[PDB]
Paper text:
PTPN21 belongs to the four-point-one, ezrin, radixin, moesin (FERM) domain–containing protein tyrosine phosphatases (PTP) and plays important roles in cytoskeleton-associated cellular processes like cell adhesion, motility, and cargo transport. Because of the presence of a WPE loop instead of a WPD loop in the phosphatase domain, it is often considered to lack phosphatase activity. However, many of PTPN21’s biological functions require its catalytic activity.
The N terminus FERM domain of PTPN21 (18 to 319) crystallized in space group P212121 with two molecules in the asymmetric unit, and the structure was determined at 2.1 Å. The two molecules are quite similar and adopt the three-lobed cloverleaf architecture (F1, F2, and F3) characteristic of the archetypical FERM domains found in radixin, moesin, and focal adhesion kinase. The F1 lobe (21 to 106) exhibits a ubiquitin-like fold and is composed of a five-stranded β sheet covered by two α helices. The F2 and F3 lobes both interact with F1, and this arrangement holds the three subdomains together. Fortuitously, two MPD molecules were buried in the hydrophobic pockets of the F2 lobe. Using PIP-Strips lipid dot blot analysis, we found that PTPN21 FERM associated with certain phosphatidylinositol phosphate species as well as phosphatidic acid. Triple mutation of positively charged residues (K82, K86, and K291) greatly weakened the FERM-lipid interaction.
Author numbering:
A (entry chain A): 24 to 308
B (entry chain B): 21 to 308
Write the structure that this text describes.
Amino acid sequence: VARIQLLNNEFVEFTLSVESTGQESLEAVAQRLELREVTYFSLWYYNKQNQRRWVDLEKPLKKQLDKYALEPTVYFGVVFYVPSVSQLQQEITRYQYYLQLKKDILEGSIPCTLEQAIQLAGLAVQADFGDFDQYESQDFLQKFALFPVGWLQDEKVLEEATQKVALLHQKYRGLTAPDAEMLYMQEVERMDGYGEESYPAKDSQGSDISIGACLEGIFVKHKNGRHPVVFRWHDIANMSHNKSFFALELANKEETIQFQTEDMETAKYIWRLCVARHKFYRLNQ
Amino acid sequence: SCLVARIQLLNNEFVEFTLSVESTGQESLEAVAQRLELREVTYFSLWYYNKQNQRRWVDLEKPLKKQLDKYALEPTVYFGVVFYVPSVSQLQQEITRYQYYLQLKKDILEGSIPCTLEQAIQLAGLAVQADFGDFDQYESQDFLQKFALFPVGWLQDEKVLEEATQKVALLHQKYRGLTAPDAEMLYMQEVERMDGYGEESYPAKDSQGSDISIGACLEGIFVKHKNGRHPVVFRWHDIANMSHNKSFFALELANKEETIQFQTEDMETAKYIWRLCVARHKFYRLNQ
């Protein structure tokens, strides 16, 4: 009854029961991939406004899609990001993680400079194509584009960037795909934006902010940029949602912090992901 | 040679009947289906309270008198659902659905599927419409006062119970025209989504000597802890075999040396848990 886009961008049709949960569908994908470390992963969909929303894994999936999704398609992905990918035990887990981190770079959720894009491309081509070959390299320049279509609009810049990636590819001769993938993920893990999911909100004064979860806790960014704040997981005594508001209680403060979101439903969703991430980093730390 | 037995039907009616030495469990169950004109009998069976006051489903292919004699506190059996479907929309006959509805309403009212005040009101509204029909067929709605509408154990607040009862009467008025099979199907579709629905668990002890509750669900074998450590499910696809050696019910996990062992109080109990989990595995396999 279902369509899932995997991290390799392949669409698979999955025939599951009527009232089967999001967890059940997640487990069937994992079984297909022979993925054993499923806890890092989940499924998301485009809602009726085409905003991405992770599924509620403990509820029937059909009814979630019937009610909130424009189309009955879900997407496999990483919901819980680790501080160090060496914590991932099996190669299949690491490969799936690697595909997700590449998508985060391609989609700009983890911004990168041109230099960073070049260095990452160098490891990725070794991971994805094996050892450099002078003939396959020139063929590649015709088959595919190395950088996303809008990143380098300047012909000479694109050419020098591409040649630099080629030189790095040659320097990585002999790296196995799992090793190249690990080096790639070890660089992406130290990049700003890694493991962050943000949402618009307003603070108690009416100012526009970005709030979200990061490796270290709940963060608040003001348009200032002058002072970003993180409430570390260990310091958060409680979290709640009520109508459009998402709220934090800190252990060291009898003053709770309130964030106004767009929706009652958005507040509930943000609260749910923040609670799940708090639980994860409690276990993982 | 003869046992004066007793059966409580799902409408809480009691029916006495004598039991021969050769009367088997499938036989007595078959008679109950005849009395109800019930054709989809496979979901249903008979259980009794054993001498330790736990529910035991009868061995259908073994003589019934002997079972009640060695194990039952009294010669009373209870008609009930042994195999809970995940969607009651699969039940085909109106008789089948109605018997399922009686069972699900008993599950709610006895408290075995926990519910909130608001759910209990919503459910009672549909049940009243199903059981009594349109409110304006009655000179007075005073019958609401004479039948138990909600689960017992948590509604000692008399004022809250008053308003709950008034809200059930209002819902009943709003449900005028809802036919009995429709209200019953709504009732069941609401119950089937509730935590605890279809969940049956049996006492054992995990290898750490803690006292757990073990059962079979669509996803696999689940282990509950009364203290509340962490409910766990072993997925069927990960269970290579299940066993009842001596007083132990055990899972031979696939891909692993791991054998998850559970101590039961009886060699009889380990065999019963095994039979019931195997039977439920067959039932879920029969449903895609």
